[PDB]
Amino acid sequence: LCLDSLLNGTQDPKAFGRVAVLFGGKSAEREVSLKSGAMVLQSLLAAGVDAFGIDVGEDLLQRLVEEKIDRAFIILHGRGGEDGSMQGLLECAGIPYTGSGVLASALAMDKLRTKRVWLSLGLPTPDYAVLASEDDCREAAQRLGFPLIVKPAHEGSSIGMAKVGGLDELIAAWREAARYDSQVLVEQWISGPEFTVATLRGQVLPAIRLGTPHTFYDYDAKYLASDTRYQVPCGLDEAKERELKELTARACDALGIQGWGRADVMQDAEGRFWLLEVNTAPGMTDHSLVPMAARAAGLDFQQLVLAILADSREARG
Amino acid sequence: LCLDSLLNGTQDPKAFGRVAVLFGGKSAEREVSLKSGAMVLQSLLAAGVDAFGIDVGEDLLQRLVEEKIDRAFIILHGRGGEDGSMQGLLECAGIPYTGSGVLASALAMDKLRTKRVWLSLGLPTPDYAVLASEDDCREAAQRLGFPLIVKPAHEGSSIGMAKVGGLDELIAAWREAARYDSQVLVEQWISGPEFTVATLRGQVLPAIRLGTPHTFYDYDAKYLASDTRYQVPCGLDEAKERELKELTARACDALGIQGWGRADVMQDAEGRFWLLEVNTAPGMTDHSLVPMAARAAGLDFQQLVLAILADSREARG
Ligand SMILES: Nc1ncnc2c1ncn2[C@@H]1O[C@H](COP(=O)(O)OP(=O)(O)OP(=O)(O)O)[C@@H](O)[C@H]1O
Numbered sequence A, B: 001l002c003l004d005s006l007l008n009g010t011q012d013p014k015a016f017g018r019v020a021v022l023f024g025g026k027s028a029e030r031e032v033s034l035k036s037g038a039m040v041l042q043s044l045l046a047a048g049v050d051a052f053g054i055d056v057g058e059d060l061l062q063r064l065v066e067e068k069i070d071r072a073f074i075i076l077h078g079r080g081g082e083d084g085s086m087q088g089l090l091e092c093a094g095i096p097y098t099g100s101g102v103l104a105s106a107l108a109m110d111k112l113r114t115k116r117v118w119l120s121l122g123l124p125t126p127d128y129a130v131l132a133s134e135d136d137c138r139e140a141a142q143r144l145g146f147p148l149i150v151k152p153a154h155e156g157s158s159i160g161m162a163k164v165g166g167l168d169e170l171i172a173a174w175r176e177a178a179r180y181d182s183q184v185l186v187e188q189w190i191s192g193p194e195f196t197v198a199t200l201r202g203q204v205l206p207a208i209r210l211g212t213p214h215t216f217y218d219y220d221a222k223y224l225a226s227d228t229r230y231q232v233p234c235g236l237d238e239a240k241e242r243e244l245k246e247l248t249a250r251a252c253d254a255l256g257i258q259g260w261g262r263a264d265v266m267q268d269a270e271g272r273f274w275l276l277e278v279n280t281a282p283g284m285t286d287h288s289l290v291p292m293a294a295r296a297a298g299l300d301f302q303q304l305v306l307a308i309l310a311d312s313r314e315a316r317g
């Protein structure tokens, strides 16, 4: 009955009209978005959807006035795609689109604002600091200890991220992340199992436990390595996995996520869950996680992209 | 010295290039935005700026690919203009623009989200309820009492608003506001002096006290009536006006306002201030308030629009 609700308006691919798959862009995750778009476009075409691709670049507005578009599938990654900017352009152009609206996308792209919202609601997210100075690195070390994990506030795909074990590599990781974003945050390192929880049309999909011999789930482990471990069902018991899913729903509703999304959650040695971030246009590569979660629920890749598309027939927030 | 910082990059009008004044649109405040744009455009032209106007409509993307534009002056009012959507379109198009960024504009357009952020920071804003039912109207009445003020969450210019003194007109005002927005909120009526506080380039301008023989500061009193009262300096003492200005700065920084903006604040019988809302593209008509506040600080209309333009030469958030 739940899977019936997920496939609600997926029966007629022709009913969606001409669908523009938006991918590429000029963000650091461009290469990831190129493969996600190729997956989504090929999937929509095999399903019988009148779908075409658009490599988002300096060409975009020219293509929006030339091409007829009944609906846009946003599968861009990072700034210029997941930060509400592309969402606002499509609303001005009067084109309906997939995923979260302008406010939710802009908020979820900002890891600092996202964590700040979660804290005001009493949701767990690792203690952190904002780094714009070598003195800031020293204060964060004195208050939070080691190890730490440094990340730009607005990036994805573990780009510009580093786990640091001392002040020496903390300062080097801050300078590296600052080449991607003047907004640099550092979090307390959570030591324990890593989970990721996909949500689709207000339903929380099966959780996936992630493992890699790397120091963390970095760009290489996500997209290039062969020894990354994916486990579904996750080793959690029914009470613990239910707790994780209810935490994911609250964390996504806190930001206003719509259509679909993915939450990345850590668990510590005492069983506590810690929210890291939420993605509003998760990767759709053949290495990606939301497709794995969809299969566990029973949807193949074509049903998944059709479900994301059918959800957009209503209104964003 | 403060006024020097306000006029920082206003000396060379030719230095801004070709400036597109964006006005009109399809929101309920279209007629207001048409007059604000006419004021801003005429002001920029008399200052020696290579400025042209664009009536935002179904024409927009076609005009953005035809016209050369070095900088956009956003003077649209309401949804499609102040809600981050136009801001996101201009960022995708690579055009710098005036005012708050995508996240701040989208947040400040939403009165519910704005009040919700203020509450988490301990800033004062009237107790409220969300109305989507006649039972909701009854619960709000039982909890908040009378009188009340009903408003759509995303409107401006007092459109769809009504002060209600009983359950009969509460329910009628809810149905009327729901024709503009499925998001309807009702606030506790604050009885006392009304102030409005303009901010420009991180500086808080002199406060203006507002008075009208109407039941409240409605669309008619704002734009059509002759007996609306504007008082600058406001009757507050130095300690009280300083308190109001520091509250305005905190309320604007809470949402991420940039460039300029205006806050509307009520004061009750016991001297307490209550934040109503923040506008990220305030009206610029000859009835409008930000020009009055600028004159009190020493800037005429041309210096004001040049200052808004010079601030945009940096980066939005
Ligand atoms: N506080 C933390 N404690 C432990 N590991 C962490 C922490 N924050 C991040 N990580 C690790 O770094 C990885 C990337 O972190 P995060 O998901 O916040 O970054 P992202 O680049 O935005 O990711 P994505 O590819 O999902 O867009 C996580 O999958 C996790 O392995």
Ligand SMILES: Nc1ncnc2c1ncn2[C@@H]1O[C@H](COP(=O)(O)OP(=O)(O)OP(=O)(O)O)[C@@H](O)[C@H]1O
Residues within 6 Å of the ligand: B126, B149, B151, B155, B156, B157, B158, B159, B161, B187, B188, B189, B190, B191, B194, B216, B217, B218, B222, B264, B266, B276, B277, B279
């Ligand atoms: N809680 C309240 N108590 C008393 N008066 C109120 C209250 N809320 C609103 N008002 C009155 O209604 C007017 C319009 O309210 P508000 O500024 O929230 O609406 P708006 O339509 O978004 O305004 P604007 O023209 O500034 O965009 C205020 O100027 C004030 O006179």
Ligand SMILES: [Mg+2]
Residues within 6 Å of the ligand: A155, A156, A157, A277, A278, A279
């Ligand atoms: Mg991410």
Ligand SMILES: [Mg+2]
Residues within 6 Å of the ligand: A157, A264, A277
């Ligand atoms: Mg992640």
Ligand SMILES: [Mg+2]
Residues within 6 Å of the ligand: B155, B156, B157, B277, B278, B279
């Ligand atoms: Mg307003």
Ligand SMILES: [Mg+2]
Residues within 6 Å of the ligand: B157, B264, B277
């Ligand atoms: Mg107002």
